[PDB]
Design a protein around this ligand. Structure first.
Ligand SMILES: Cc1cc2nc3c(=O)[nH]c(=O)nc-3n(C[C@H](O)[C@H](O)[C@H](O)COP(=O)(O)OP(=O)(O)OC[C@H]3O[C@@H](n4cnc5c(N)ncnc54)[C@H](O)[C@@H]3O)c2cc1C
Ligand SMILES: Cc1cc2nc3c(=O)[nH]c(=O)nc-3n(C[C@H](O)[C@H](O)[C@H](O)COP(=O)(O)OP(=O)(O)OC[C@H]3O[C@@H](n4cnc5c(N)ncnc54)[C@H](O)[C@@H]3O)c2cc1C
Ligand SMILES: NC(=O)c1ccc[n+]([C@@H]2O[C@H](COP(=O)([O-])OP(=O)(O)OC[C@H]3O[C@@H](n4cnc5c(N)ncnc54)[C@H](OP(=O)(O)O)[C@@H]3O)[C@@H](O)[C@H]2O)c1
Ligand SMILES: NC(=O)c1ccc[n+]([C@@H]2O[C@H](COP(=O)([O-])OP(=O)(O)OC[C@H]3O[C@@H](n4cnc5c(N)ncnc54)[C@H](OP(=O)(O)O)[C@@H]3O)[C@@H](O)[C@H]2O)c1
Ligand SMILES: CCCCCCCCCCCCO[C@@H]1O[C@H](CO)[C@@H](O[C@H]2O[C@H](CO)[C@@H](O)[C@H](O)[C@H]2O)[C@H](O)[C@H]1O
Ligand SMILES: OC[C@H]1O[C@H](O)[C@H](O)[C@@H](O)[C@@H]1O
Ligand SMILES: OC[C@H]1O[C@H](O)[C@H](O)[C@@H](O)[C@@H]1O
Lengths: 504, 504
């Protein structure tokens, strides 16, 4: 009498959502609208309808040790910050090791997920799915939604009077792939998220002049941290977490801001914003400062008005003979197949722990990977998936509707106090906070106080070292044999791919 | 009556050597073998015989405020680290301001410069020159040699057994221009001078894999120094100079090395050499560490042997399916037109203050810009030129042959004690030491002790601020009226091109 779980999407979130089903003995059916896995990380030269488009050169901004699945370490020889193709290969490896591919039926789009007539007792969903033009209806005991949130382009043309008049080319970051078409041209980038940044430096290699236009400015991080350790291996350690907690937000901020200014002074470089370090989604770009100091990227304020030829800026300055404008203005999400269960408006959604609709008579619809962490999504989707599948079996249970809604509203409230008021700051999470939060719900949070005495060597690494995901496969339901071994050898794996010449 | 001076070459050194002549009332004839000025900084898509070839993307590693001519500051809006095109434009500006172009005859190569029969009394040179096939002979009262030293490729194929056997492409850095010739290829770079570095990162943008092969390793700097000030504006300040002098070499070294390790640990990154920071010509690359941590540049030891397909490395590791090898193995210099007078063998020459042959009955042959400074060459060539033209008249005089040769030998000796034993470390200079040394001989060293009392505001900048070249146009022979004004506004010009977006 095995519960059948629909997993929608076969990216990082889909893949782990299948594994998490199999591991609690549920039968996963996985629908994936394209002809392969990886979702966002499977680069193609052309954009595809209804799946995340990326550019060829993209290198992931989260260290391999911090983004691995908890029970499947990334290979020793893989670099600390992997190219999009290496992320994809690792996903393929994950899917072979846990035999996930057979449960996927590709080329299959999910049109509709409606609670059934008997939902108040059965908790079951009517999933409708088209496949090369032929419909199909099925019933399921639970649904895990693993569609992305970097798919539907946010192209706010309405807030750029005279863009309709502009006679150069202009398009969303989505459609950017390589800089060939920009040799010796003058290009404006709108927005200073990681798309803005990546494109501003890349296009500046070929282009005559790139302008990086920001309406706010940005605090700007480097993945090459102190001593060349990955910045997230350093910042996301339980010790740094504890130091942050006693020191408070505004002092943490002053530390981080003063750190970033030592690298380059955001005021002198024209990038300094009115907000604080932790009030914005981190923009990571080690190359941007060096391009700015050479004039090949020019930091600008917001474009107020476009002509046939030019941009006018909020400060009355003007830039002429503009060949192309790219809107790195980011993405909005929605659920066309769930316009009954889950509602989103301008990236505002209400979900308990970012996962469960609170207004469900049964807890049988999980939303996986709908978070913007200061960290990797894959490891959080996995914990979301461990938890999700447990409440599908009734091994764990949700609070009452009204107390779910208090936590939801409490979260939206402090997120709104903390983060700059923009559509991209609606689902922010911190990495350690989030991993612990969901780990505690699954009962796999490592007992670090006991281990202090029962194993002082492990205990030390767990605390003073990086808060690696493998940490959450030590104890509890999904307990993994080789967690302790891998957790201790985490240094070796960070160094393996860098000691390619002997020094001694 | 007024002495005629042959200036050989019309790059940075030629251009300033003409101006230095005009300013001591001498008649310059300038022979340039090419059809234009700029020498090394005039990029063309094809390499040209007997003039420095560079790559399209080259950005100068010395700050604008540290490389300007002493009496012609670079415009406000020009960036702190200029692209090769902007260096060239600035030279064109210099040549307009001081009306130098009319004294150049282009397409004219100097074949021979021989001391004349009456040289022990007349001090005159037989300069022979071909111009579109037809020779021409002339006599001169002095010769300033401004041929470069980054023209004749050093391609040491003999020390790569099996390169004759290799079936991919291979060429010297000289012939490199763009990375698009390497898309999806596996490329090995020999050498980690600035060409090695530049190409290793550039080619890694298109290439499947780049390997950066060094037989030594290298200490590696960043142009974006503390708070995003140009590193040379910070390191080359009389104050830093004095701090260095009391602390000694080994302590200075430990400071610089510990500084570079904070950015990235040269041991972990596999770049750390057995020598010290100041024992090697500085390799500057802000972008290299980020490419190494992503695997797109792989640090290797020396190639011991090439096959049809592969490189074998000094540590017995092998890399297969290698499409292309670029020898960034640097340059040798020589004087084909001066074999009678000046002897150069594997970059070892004997010249008093790097300028004067010591064995000359008259001091009427100056060698301009034959130095490898921890700084800009242009400003040193200029001071060399001020001095040179003074000793051509009778304003200044050289020591006796015997005491010149003791100083020459003393210089070669301590240079050999300090620097790693290699062809490119035969003419190393320190910037401040060298500027002061030559300034003192011209009597234009600024009297900073006097100014302490005569002008404490200026005195402070001269000491605590950057040791800008304009400093040496304050007092003495060539005195410039607008020096003090520019020296004080030096911060403004560093910031002008970076505050392109409103802060307040
Ligand atoms: C340029 C860029 C860089 C990024 N870098 C990082 C990073 O460094 N670290 C990080 O943690 N995150 C990063 N992200 C965020 C990124 O989205 C996540 O890392 C990761 O892609 C999450 O994948 P997912 O499986 O949750 O969603 P996706 O990868 O988008 O997977 C969704 C899948 O569902 C399919 N699908 C869509 N609609 C349907 C439907 N109706 N029915 C069936 N299938 C459907 C899609 O075709 C796709 O295969 C980046 C995003 C971008 C755009
Ligand atoms: C990629 C690269 C980057 C560099 N970056 C820097 C830097 O950042 N800072 C720095 O200070 N230095 C740098 N250098 C060093 C460089 O040598 C100087 O910047 C500067 O260009 C030297 O100028 P020059 O006039 O001494 O030589 P060149 O510019 O080489 O001038 C030589 C001229 O003489 C002509 N010539 C040669 N032989 C004859 C002949 N027999 N008769 C007539 N004409 C002749 C040539 O055609 C040419 O016009 C760099 C070098 C390279 C290759
Ligand atoms: N691995 C990588 O290197 C990499 C590369 C690219 C992207 N990413 C990831 O991809 C995700 C989204 O990418 P993104 O950078 O395109 O998204 P983003 O962070 O939403 O970028 C949006 C940028 O555009 C600005 N903007 C938005 N609307 C605007 C308007 N109407 N007018 C003017 N300016 C406007 C934003 O300012 P506000 O602050 O006002 O919103 C912001 O600077 C992020 O999770 C990021 O981590 C990663
Ligand atoms: N503005 C810029 O960005 C820029 C760019 C490029 C060049 N430049 C300048 O132009 C000048 C030329 O520099 P470059 O990189 O062309 O040459 P370089 O400084 O002479 O360095 C050559 C490299 O090749 C190595 N090498 C030499 N012979 C070798 C051999 N037989 N086997 C293996 N390796 C060998 C050297 O090692 P050793 O240490 O053993 O000599 C060194 O690492 C330099 O002053 C540089 O600063 C500036
Ligand atoms: C430049 C000044 C360096 O300042 C540096 O700050 C970082 C905080 O991110 C600390 O760096 C690290 O230390 C601890 C101790 O092993 C680690 O658990 C943690 O990953 C990290 O925070 C350094 O201990 C401190 O010296
Ligand atoms: O059409 C979208 C764009 O694709 C690529 O990014 C090209 O470089 C660009 O020229 C083109 O306009
Ligand atoms: O933000 C206000 C306060 O928050 C925390 O309680 C800190 O311990 C304290 O030092 C800080 O001033």
């Amino acid at each position: 009498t095995k519960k059948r779980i629909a997993v929608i999407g076969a990216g990082a979130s889909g893949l782990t959502s299948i594994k998490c089903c199999l591991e609690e003995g549920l039968e996963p059916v996985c629908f994936e609208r394209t002809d392969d896995i990886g979702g966002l990380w499977r680069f193609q030269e052309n954009p595809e309808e209804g799946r995340a488009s990326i550019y060829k050169s993209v290198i992931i901004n989260t260290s391999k040790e911090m983004m691995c699945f908890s029970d499947y370490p990334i290979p020793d020889h893989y670099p600390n910050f992997m190219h999009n193709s290496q992320v994809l290969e690792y996903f393929r490896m994950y899917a072979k090791e846990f035999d996930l591919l057979k449960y996927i039926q590709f080329k299959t789009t999910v049109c509709s997920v409606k609670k059934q007539p008997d939902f108040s007792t059965s908790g079951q969903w009517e999933v409708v799915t088209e496949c090369e033009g032929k419909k199909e209806v099925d019933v399921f005991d639970g649904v895990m939604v693993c569609t992305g949130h970097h798919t539907n382009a946010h192209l706010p043309l309405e807030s750029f009077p005279g863009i309709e008049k502009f006679k150069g080319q202009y398009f969303h970051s989505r459609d950017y792939k390589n800089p060939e078409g920009f040799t010796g041209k003058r290009v404006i980038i709108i927005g200073i998220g990681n798309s803005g940044g990546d494109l501003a430096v890349e296009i500046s290699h070929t282009a005559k002049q790139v302008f990086l236009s920001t309406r706010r400015g940005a605090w700007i991080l480097n993945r090459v941290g102190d001593h060349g350790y990955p910045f997230d291996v350093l910042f996301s350690s339980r010790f740094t977490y504890f130091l942050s907690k006693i020191c408070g937000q505004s002092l943490s901020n002053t530390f981080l801001e003063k750190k970033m200014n030592q690298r380059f002074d955001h005021e002198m470089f024209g990038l300094k914003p009115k907000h604080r370090a932790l009030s914005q989604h981190p923009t990571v770009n080690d190359d941007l400062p060096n391009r700015i100091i050479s004039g090949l990227v020019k930091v600008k304020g917001n474009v107020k008005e476009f002509t046939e030829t030019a941009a006018i800026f909020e400060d009355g300055s003007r830039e002429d003979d503009i060949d192309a404008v790219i809107f790195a203005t980011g993405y909005s999400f929605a659920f066309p197949f769930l316009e009954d269960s889950v509602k989103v408006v301008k990236n505002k959604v209400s979900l308990y722990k970012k996962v469960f609709p609170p207004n469900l008579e049964k807890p049988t619809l999980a939303i996986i990977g709908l978070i913007q962490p200061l960290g990797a999504i894959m490891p959080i989707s996995e914990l979301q998936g461990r938890w999700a599948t447990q409440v599908f079996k009734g091994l764990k249970t949700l609070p009452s509707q009204s107390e779910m809604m208090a936590e939801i509203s409490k979260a939206q409230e402090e997120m709104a106090k903390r983060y700059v008021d923009s559509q991209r700051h609606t689902i922010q999470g911190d990495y350690i906070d989030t991993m612990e939060e969901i780990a505690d719900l699954v009962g796999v949070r490592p007992n670090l106080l006991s281990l202090a005495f029962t194993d002082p060597k492990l205990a030390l690494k767990l605390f003073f070292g990086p808060c690696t995901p493998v940490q959450y496969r030590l104890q509890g339901p999904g307990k993994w044999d080789g967690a302790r071994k891998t957790i201790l050898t985490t240094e070796d794996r960070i160094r393996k791919p860098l000691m390619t010449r002997v020094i001694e």
